[PDB]
Ligand binder design. Structure first.
Ligand SMILES: *[C@H]1O[C@H](CO)[C@@H](O)[C@H](O)[C@H]1NC(C)=O
Ligand SMILES: CO[C@@H]1[C@@H](N)[C@@H](O)[C@@H](O)[C@H]1O
Ligand SMILES: [Zn+2]
Length: 1016
């Protein structure tokens, strides 16, 4: 039934990897169309019986933060644009306008008086103002996780359905810096029929234009049948501004931007200004304009032409509305009345364009090509590849992934109950969703905003994290307290969250120590949550005020624990070394938590006078010349010292890892009998060019291949324990840590690029894997796409987004690096992987940001490193454009993105505490996730509704027998189900009423949404 996503290579007209292999990418001067050619057309193509229909679509690109904050732009610009759009559209019934960013629209609409709300609903209902996409933002497509792309889409569309009674089916993405097939994937599963994109490499625009392949049915790279296909229009020219949207010659098109005659402080850089249309010039002006249109029309297959009319924060002043409208009206009246042009031109909306294109298609006038692939890495001109923003502001890129998970966990934990309005649950979740959604903007997560705007996004996300914590901890208290005892104060913190990796050790001292003592408090309850729909074990760690602590479950069964010191690294400005200091007051206790699917498990930490039976203590070895003592208070094992030396470690039955005397991985041995496979971590630096174009927040313009970071004789700390071991080294700008818990290691880098101007720090893996020029990177955490390194392109063009993982492989061996944050990376030589850690750039890169990137701050990047044998795996053929993770790698990615949540009970005693929640939840097959669980109704609704987004990935078959797992029917997770419906992914349209109220599991690579309805 399900399509085979591995073994059937789709047949498409354009496959972007194949196209890339064949294209020459020459950057030649094409004439007035600088990156194209001199377009010719047959004037006889259009005639009385076959006219060119032209839709001029007014628009205004409104960034939710960039050079100003959201609120600053709203006050200075966007509120005036929307107020004037309302007035002008009301008064001019043929004028049209499209609007994309619902974050702004919702802010505006809720501030309007009722009379104006009604006026606004009227111009939407009548088709004059049309929403395009309808997301909270126009998101980045490179660094964004698909879950957050869906979150922001749902946030905007849910608002539009409720207030505007419309759901857009056409998408408009004119500004993201390159484009991802994750967008049509999500949009096509959310009711869309059409989409538009703009920022694709200039060589790609030229190639596709020459073949009239700028409109295409964009399907997923694994989709053999084509059911994922979404009609896509790629605009052909360098910009979406007016000079680059009327036709190929911006010197002509600029004369048709009537905001550029002087009084608005704008002009045409091509040195010919616009002139007011009059009866004396309209014929000449029309001849010039129609000629541009007919040239543009040559690049497409129908007789319906899209002419966007707008730019950034346009349509602000009433005088601007008038100057554009009246001048275009005079042109339309002339052109449409002059039969010799054979043109019918009018203001239109985006949906009107697409509807007319498909009318032409159905009339047999055109057939469209099929396409798969992506549109990274973008270059707008010459060698200016926009791969810098895959890394810029990495602190906030990491924060995005933390908040992603906290939103999911808060929505899921609170979904199990209906809450009184006084609990402020819906309020806090809406805030958290909206702040995370805002950050998906293409100047948010991308790291391309001004410093104070980055600060605003951070403050918003911090508030969202606090909102999630509040909702999560109220939910845990309710789920695990005997109901007749439960007595909530909705303002009280029953638990505090404990997060070991955010902001992280060395970033913020934010974690609470569990303070135990005979004279204060002998024990403490902690609770773990597992948002994934399968039973999960994971080591968890807490800070405690004594090393003499033991762990029990709530049935009072001992749980094996390990205590390690709390180590912090310090750049010692006196000794000029970077070295670790141990706490003599707090210690880390580590134990394996086992947690039900979408469930909770409670444990107890108890102090004793001396070493507990079931708690062991790690050894610690500090490798450095010239050591000094390292006291650890009550910690029972004395620190050992040694000169730097190679070391080997093995935890459990896991791999054996060998490290250099500099504390960097050099080899991995999977099993005791197997080989020591060379796998070498190295840190290098890229610089900036002293001549020509400089790297900045968008562009990566390295001054050649990276140079090794000079390491000196760094201090290496080795901690060896029964449950967890680690090697940590204080390198310049990076405290690098390899942590072993008995599977694939976890790597953590505390990255502080300090004051190193014009430097990008890269982490590289060097191996013996015969990968050649092939490597794989993911798109939005959804799919892995084959990449081919092209030596015909510059280094920066071979960088791709690494939103969640990357791998190289040969016939026998694969190395996969999973990430907890999006970063840029590549494989610049056979056997290598590399990923950028941070970048500090003194110069602006001439895209309008007007600053470098000099606001770096310490960030804790996290990874898992999975070396595997893959010779037995059923892989796609050599011609297939996708790749797929193994289960170990997929589970490793889940451990980074959706770890267990940890809660520490705040008060001294928890009366009515229970040991577990969710023990009866089905443990679903490992490839299935409940990406979203969200109650959709407030407590006043007689019929409660709960929405679920289910995602099935595809894992490679490598000969591990499939185990018994339980069917997950999300529609029966809550009792008293009365109806189960399959819906669009935004939950806004019912697609199927489900028999027996049973939600079927989805196919590999598919995502489905279901809503269950419950009598309450
Ligand atoms: C809005 O649009 C629908 C079509 O989806 C229309 O039939 C209905 O009358 C309107 N619904 C409202 C205002 O709730
Ligand atoms: C690259 O130029 C973009 C501009 N068009 C702005 O809208 C902002 O998004 C900026 O990043
Ligand atoms: Zn923008």
């Amino acid at each position: 039934q399900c399509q085979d996503v591995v073994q059937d290579v789709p047949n498409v007209d354009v496959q972007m990897l194949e196209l890339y292999d064949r294209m020459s990418f020459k950057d030649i001067d094409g004439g007035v169309w600088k990156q194209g050619w001199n377009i010719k057309y047959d004037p006889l193509k259009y005639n009385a019986h076959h006219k060119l229909k032209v839709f001029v679509v007014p628009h205004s690109h409104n960034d939710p933060g960039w050079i100003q904050t959201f609120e600053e732009y709203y006050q200075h610009d966007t509120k005036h644009i929307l107020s004037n759009a309302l007035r002008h559209l009301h008064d001019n019934p043929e004028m049209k306008f499209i609007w994309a960013e619902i974050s702004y629209f919702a802010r505006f609409y809720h501030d309007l008086g009722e009379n104006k709300k009604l006026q606004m609903k009227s111009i939407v209902k009548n088709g004059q103002l049309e929403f395009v996409t309808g997301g909270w933002v126009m998101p980045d497509e490179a660094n964004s996780h698909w879950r957050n792309v869906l979150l922001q889409l749902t946030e905007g569309q849910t608002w539009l359905k409720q207030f505007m009674n419309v759901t857009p089916t056409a998408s408009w993405a004119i500004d993201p810096f390159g484009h991802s097939p994750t967008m049509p994937y999500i949009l096509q599963k959310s009711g869309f029929k059409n989409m538009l994109i703009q920022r694709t490499h200039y060589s790609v625009k030229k190639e596709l234009a020459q073949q009239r392949q700028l409109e295409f049915l964009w399907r997923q790279i694994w989709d053999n049948k084509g059911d994922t296909a979404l009609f896509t229009h790629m605009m052909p020219f360098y910009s979406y501004d007016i000079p680059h949207t009327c036709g190929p010659d911006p010197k002509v098109c600029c004369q048709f931007d009537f905001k550029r005659m002087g009084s608005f402080g704008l002009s045409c850089p091509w040195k010919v200004p616009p002139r007011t249309i009059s009866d004396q010039n309209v014929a000449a002006r029309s001849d010039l304009l129609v000629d541009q249109w007919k040239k543009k029309a040559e690049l497409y297959r129908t007789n319906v032409l899209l002419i966007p009319l707008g730019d950034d924060f346009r349509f602000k002043q009433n005088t601007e509305w008038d100057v554009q409208r009246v001048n275009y009206e005079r042109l339309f009246e002339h052109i449409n009345s002059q039969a010799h042009f054979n043109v019918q031109a009018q203001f239109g909306t985006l949906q009107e364009y697409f509807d007319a294109v498909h009318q032409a298609e159905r009339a047999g006038q055109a057939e469209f090509p099929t396409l798969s692939g992506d549109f990274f890495t973008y270059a707008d001109r010459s060698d200016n590849y926009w791969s810098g923003y895959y890394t810029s502001r990495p602190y906030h890129k990491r924060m995005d992934r933390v908040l992603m998970h906290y939103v999911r966990a808060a929505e899921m934990l609170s979904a199990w109950h209906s809450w009184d309005g006084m609990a402020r649950i819906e309020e806090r979740l809406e805030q958290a969703r909206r702040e995370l959604s805002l950050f998906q903007h293409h100047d948010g997560i991308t790291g391309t905003a001004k410093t104070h705007v980055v600060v605003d996004y951070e403050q918003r996300m911090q508030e969202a994290l606090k909102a999630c914590q509040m909702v999560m901890q109220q939910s845990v208290y309710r789920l695990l307290t005997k109901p007749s005892i439960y007595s909530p104060d909705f303002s009280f913190s029953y638990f505090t969250l404990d997060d070991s990796r955010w902001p992280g050790s060395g970033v913020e001292d934010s974690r609470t120590t569990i303070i135990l003592g005979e004279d204060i408090l002998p024990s403490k309850h902690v609770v773990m949550h597992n948002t994934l729909p399968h039973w999960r074990e994971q080591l968890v760690d807490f800070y405690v005020s004594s090393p003499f602590v033991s762990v029990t479950d709530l049935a009072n069964n001992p749980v094996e624990a390990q205590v390690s010191p709390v180590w912090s690294w310090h750049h010692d400005t006196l000794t000029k070394t970077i070295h670790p200091q141990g706490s003599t007051t707090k210690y880390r206790i580590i134990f394996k938590a086992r947690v039900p699917p979408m469930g909770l498990a409670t444990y107890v930490l108890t102090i004793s006078d001396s070493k507990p039976e079931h708690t062991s203590y790690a050894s610690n070895l500090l490798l450095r010349k010239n050591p000094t003592s390292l006291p650890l208070g009550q910690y029972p094992e004395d620190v050992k010292f040694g000169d730097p030396r190679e070391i080997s470690l093995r935890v459990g039955n896991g791999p054996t890892l060998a490290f250099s005397e500099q504390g960097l991985l050099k080899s991995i041995q999977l099993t005791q009998d197997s080989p020591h496979v060379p796998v070498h971590f190295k840190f290098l630096k890229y610089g900036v060019r002293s001549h020509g174009d400089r790297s900045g927040a968008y562009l990566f313009l390295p001054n050649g291949p990276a140079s090794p970071v000079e390491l000196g004789q760094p201090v290496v700390l080795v901690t060896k324990g029964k449950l967890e071991s680690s090697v940590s080294v204080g390198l310049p700008s990076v405290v690098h840590q390899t942590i072993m818990r008995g599977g694939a290691p976890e790597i953590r880098n505390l990255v502080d690029i300090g004051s190193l101007d014009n430097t990008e720090i890269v982490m590289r893996l060097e191996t013996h894997i015969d990968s050649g020029d092939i490597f794989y990177t993911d798109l939005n955490g959804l799919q892995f796409i084959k990449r081919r390194r092209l030596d015909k392109l510059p280094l920066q063009a071979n960088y791709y987004p690494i939103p969640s993982g990357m791998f190289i492989e040969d016939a026998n061996t694969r190395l996969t690096l999973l990430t907890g944050q999006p970063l840029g990376g590549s494989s610049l030589a056979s056997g290598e992987l590399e990923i950028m850690q941070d970048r500090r750039l003194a110069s602006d890169d001439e895209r309008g940001l007007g600053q470098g990137v000099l606001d770096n701050k310490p960030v804790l990047h996290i990874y898992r490193l999975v070396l595997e044998k893959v010779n037995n795996c059923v892989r796609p053929s050599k011609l297939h454009p996708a790749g797929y993770l193994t289960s170990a790698a997929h589970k490793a990615s889940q451990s980074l993105l959706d770890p267990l949540d940890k809660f520490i009970f705040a008060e001294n005693e928890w009366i009515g505490a229970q040991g577990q929640f969710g023990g009866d939840h089905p443990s679903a097959r490992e490839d299935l996730d409940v990406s979203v669980m969200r109650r959709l109704t407030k407590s006043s609704a007689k019929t409660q509704r709960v929405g679920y987004v289910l995602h099935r990935t595809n894992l490679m078959q490598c000969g591990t027998p499939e185990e018994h797992t339980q069917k997950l029917d999300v529609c029966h997770l809550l009792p008293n189900v009365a109806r189960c419906e399959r819906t669009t992914l935004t939950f806004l349209q019912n697609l199927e009423h489900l028999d027996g109220m049973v939600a079927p599991e989805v196919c590999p690579m598919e995502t489905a949404a279901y809503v269950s309805s419950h009598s309450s």
